[model samples]
Target: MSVSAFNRRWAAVILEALTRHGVRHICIAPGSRSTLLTLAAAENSAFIHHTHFDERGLGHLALGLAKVSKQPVAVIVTSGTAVANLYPALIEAGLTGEKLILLTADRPPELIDCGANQAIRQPGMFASHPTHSISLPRPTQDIPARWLVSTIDHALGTLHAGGVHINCPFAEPLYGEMDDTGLSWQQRLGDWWQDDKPWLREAPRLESEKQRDWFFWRQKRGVVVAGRMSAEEGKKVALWAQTLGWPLIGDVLSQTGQPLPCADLWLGNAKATSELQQAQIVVQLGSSLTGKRLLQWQASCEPEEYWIVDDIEGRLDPAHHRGRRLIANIADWLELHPAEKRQPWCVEIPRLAEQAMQAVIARRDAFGEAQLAHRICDYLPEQGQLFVGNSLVVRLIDALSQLPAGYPVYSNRGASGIDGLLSTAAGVQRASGKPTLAIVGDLSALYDLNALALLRQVSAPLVLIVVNNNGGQIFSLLPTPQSERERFYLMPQNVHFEHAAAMFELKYHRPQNWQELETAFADAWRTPTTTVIEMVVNDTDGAQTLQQLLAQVSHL
Candidate 1:
């Protein structure tokens, strides 16, 4: 009958249900309201707990884990702004179709709408962002224990590869007394409580009803455009492209090995662009391309047939050019209709891409930001993951030469922003157990500075490459007036990260030239801890170098 005992029972019932639903990791942001859930998670051997001070960082951290694990990772936070802090990551998860479970602890309904210290309108906070959301009633004698388990069962069952919010409210006894009284309450579950299986398992969503006439389309001149997709999906699409003899214009995040190197550069050329326009059909797999020129070219080409095949149920065609939409898994669709090996359709495109790569290589050899981007890819371990920051960092990587096949790459291209760069990379490193590399501009690094605390938790060797151009150099490349550009657009921060490295107890290196960079990178890669490598460059020079590369490629 004790309040503490009831709270403990409620926590166990909810958490045990989650474990049965196959949730293995829980990211906990410390707070008083969430004490019961934290204690429950700590006691459960099946759940691996990760502790963080910031809920925002915890959100993206769980996002990274979910991305690699391909399962929903739970995030536990207290009421008030802690729940609000999770919105950014939740929005990203919703957009990208990544599974995340937000278990927010809140004050009871009576305390809310009053002058409660840490309570706010917690229910419906995520609104439409979460695919499934529920405001659970406070644990009481009137509420059956089975109801708690059944609610979780329904929420997770109906969840569609996005986020699920479960708002939990508890009364005064947040930290319940450790006692055996809850053991008696749990017995009500009978075999259901002790069983490892979920309370109820839902059937998988049915595949899309319509199928494309692959036989009729096989004879048409087609090209495969691969965008952000899982490594396994990318590989299958890559195989499809090879078998179909279609030029694969793979986005950097695609992780597809057969993408034409410097396809962006080739697309920029008038001659090469004209040649690609000859394709009668364009089949795009996945969504969100990194290069703007390719998207523009696709819009201008006005191919006779433009088909999109993706798993996510969203409008992937920003250009409004998709003639047919196939809402099905890439592998499932390929299995249903296999393609016959054909002769090369766009052989000239690959040749032009090779020529474009030569210009990119020439530019990359010089001492500049683009060169640094190329070097980072070159220095990465053959079997590791690469996380790229948004803005100039992602653009530079996209423009660089082809990466080796074995290494997988990742980026927060879904609602891409500068925040949570380090935290996301740290999560990937933690999940993959591989030496991870992250390249971020100065502004992005400073924006997500607090995430440096997360790097210390990573066991795998992680090299944090800071492309310190001292300002929003990516903005400088825009067509702003010189006066406004220097004063407003390029907000230069005349700062260094040596102190940040020291504070975080990470190995710090400042590479002054190509030789020093190679040495520092090698040292960082071998070290069994987090390392910060700062590559300083002039914003003006870097911008000019990009212009020169574009001109050279266009001329070629």
Candidate 2:
């Protein structure tokens, strides 16, 4: 078989397998090298191919798609730094334990380190991703028939391991007819492809009595630190905590609505103020957290048992702490926590949490984005995952939304940078494999457009509610708004993600008012595929809203 034939056949196999694996979206960033793969991917009927120009934006767009769809979305990048542009998203996907398939085009190893055009070492780029990373040998006719089968099996093995890294090397005759026979593309390829089997299996289960004792131990001071949980999950966690005499520390990412009623404590600064020390054990679920002081506090306090539970394992803490990382379903752990009689400790937390919830709800109309966040949170599904982007959007939720007692919440609070909000959220969706919501600012949304490159790969419902204030409105609330208004201070870029959804083949909507936003939000959750709801707000008004929020918080 010729190289062209190999390319075509290999392309067909990849596309067919992707489709068979239930991949629905494929994000394509134009490049000559990827034409064959892209063409093959496009031929499939079930697969949705979304094309975009900005590689970075494309990555976020793919993330957005995956976030909603909750499946492995594939991204095709041309080569060189184009692949490099995907680093931020890839890192988030790896850290957050997202399943993203990176299909990058590259020159063979011979061209590597030789200053070849558009060629660089692309293997192991995503080694840090929590899932297994793989590099497929260059396709060739000389490949042992058994080896091709073995390589395919190996590639699939990576998928089960968690995340997959697939790199393809294209040789000369990049562009040729289907029947081009001279200097067969296959003959030009190598045969020394090695396969590494993954060493993964079911986690060891604890004995029934041991498990019960573990739950009892946790029940003593086990406070559920709800990271970015869905409303439903929030309610269940909250109820479970209430029943078990445990405290619930609500997070902005947990879509548990305003005022975490089932919590034992409801202080915004409580987690940072040494109060978290009271908890003998802390069960962390989902992602999205705030307060550098809080993270530092938790990391330093050294709880009796800091069990970070999630479906995706391996370095679960985005904050990068060395704790007991337990790879298990959060619901299962919560379900098994010994149910103790409701205690006074639980009552106090829920009372305070309710007060905080009411305070925000009653005064929500008086504020803008922050209040709106409370309102939006109030409407989210009770038991799904939510990803809150760093910015006013998440802060609003952090400040106002009251999570349920057991609802886990998550946010990318590690470095607290908005570089890859969409991708991080998408990665969370992949790991959780549940309904997810992403609340983002316009700037944050634009900053990670590369996330869009994998929209089709998502297989769950991901709702992206973007608060489009036209600029980086978060700056105005800062101390130096006027002085740094134009430069890097407020460095606001004009971007309309309206076409972004269309370009990425995602469901799109622009809601102008709260009512419209509500409707869109509801519809987004009820439906599948990645849905982006662009909420346009007045920058001037949003700024004022923050000022008032600060003033309110100052009184606290």
Candidate 3:
């Protein structure tokens, strides 16, 4: 009975365009202004809807979906500063290229600067964050349905990497009948309603394999450095390294590869560092490695030739060395070029690394951060995935823990911000439908505490290991003033999460020691639902452990 039916129809058309382009996950935060998009998203049972109350949480949840599924995930939110709440996630996607589709609803032009409620300047507010963006006029009969459909198609088309923004403005009558009047212009849709094809399509282009001198590559002492690659690609790269007689240095996120154990700590060995820097070239398969030690070496390596191959295009080499960036699928490229077996190189390096890790393991005698890192991955259930949190926890895993082969590892390491980690982990488990173990520091858990609500909704078992080191104890590793360390760097807020867990109706465990920690995890995975396992250690435990480990390993 109202013209607002056109608004609903327009949203349906846009959502269909998104679905046609492989958008299966839609994140919706509650807002009256987003009524049109939410209604359309709800009716389409074809896509999974992640309904969360926090806009920031919604953005990160969508990020997790895109991370695991490798597809463009969509998010819907209302106008005003609610739109601004998504900035942190946007910054992350900008760095990691998660391919998020932000369909933010806004007030019509008539309400602009008139002191309208929940209205602010919404267009282009994200500045240069989104890879592609487009603003839309108010949905009406005057604007043909095909225009809305194709515009969405265009926006999705340009969104190859990173996120795309679509600013939607709708008039009043938020809810109304969806009867007949909307069909006046949709028949001009030209087979859109009848078929499940996109309104627009572009020509698919393949990147041709480039010519390379295999003999030159084979002779050189090329160390294979891989990060954030699939288990399949990991196998191929690992084989490539073995075939070429090169040492394989896999980041913590790398799967299937037999990476040097505890390379972050072992690299400090004077002999090991000398042998690795002797490499003639570096063949890197992926980027955004977790090891600060590795990047430090890459910055100073000055290899004869550096080639980076990744699916995501653009400059990945943070060291800015004269390197060739190959924008191609990692598996396809490796499949195309298979290598013959050659004699092994750098024998002392692996021996040194293995010996160093043994020392670290032996030193993990008591229950603390080091013990947790070295043993955490060993506890992951079958068909399980791991999401390592940013800050000291991820570094600990990098330095001490060995990654389990073939399982998926995820993180918010793009911007590496602590906010929205819980929500992101929830998204990963939902997408993969596997038991996920997320390890975070106490400060990170406190940063995104509200996102615990997201964890409560997860049907699969998600064990969140919160290493409560009192506060930001990672600063102890740096050269901070000893007097101001606690007050400024280590903001130790003594709080317990037992009540927080109870509030969300989630299972909670405060393990006093190593035996209790193992028991906590054993209890968590036995049944469904989420659990928060709190590991309480001294404030200086992690840093001092690392300091002594460094002093010991450097002498190895």
Top model number, lDDT: 3
TM-score rank, highest first? 3, 1, 2
After superposition, which runs of candidate 3 have C-alpha atoms over 4 Å from their true positions? 206-208
lDDT of 3 by residue, 421-511 (tens): 9888988888888888998888888988988998987667889988898999889888899998988988999987998899999999998
Candidate 2 per-residue lDDT over residues 271-346, each given as its tens digit: 3234456767777765556533235445566676776665554565655554467655556666765456646354
Task: Give me the displacement of residue 202 in model 1, in angstroms.
Answer: 1.4
The TM-scores, one per candidate, come to 0.96, 0.72, 0.97
Comparing 1 with 2 on lDDT, the higher-scoring candidate is: 1
Worst ten in a row by lDDT for model 1: 175-184
Better of 1 and 2 by TM-score: 1
lDDT of 1 by residue, 234-256 (tens): 78878888888888888887778
What is the C-alpha local distance difference test score of each model? 0.81, 0.62, 0.83
- Model 1 regions more than 4 Å off: 176-184, 209-212
Error of 3 at 417 (Å): 0.7
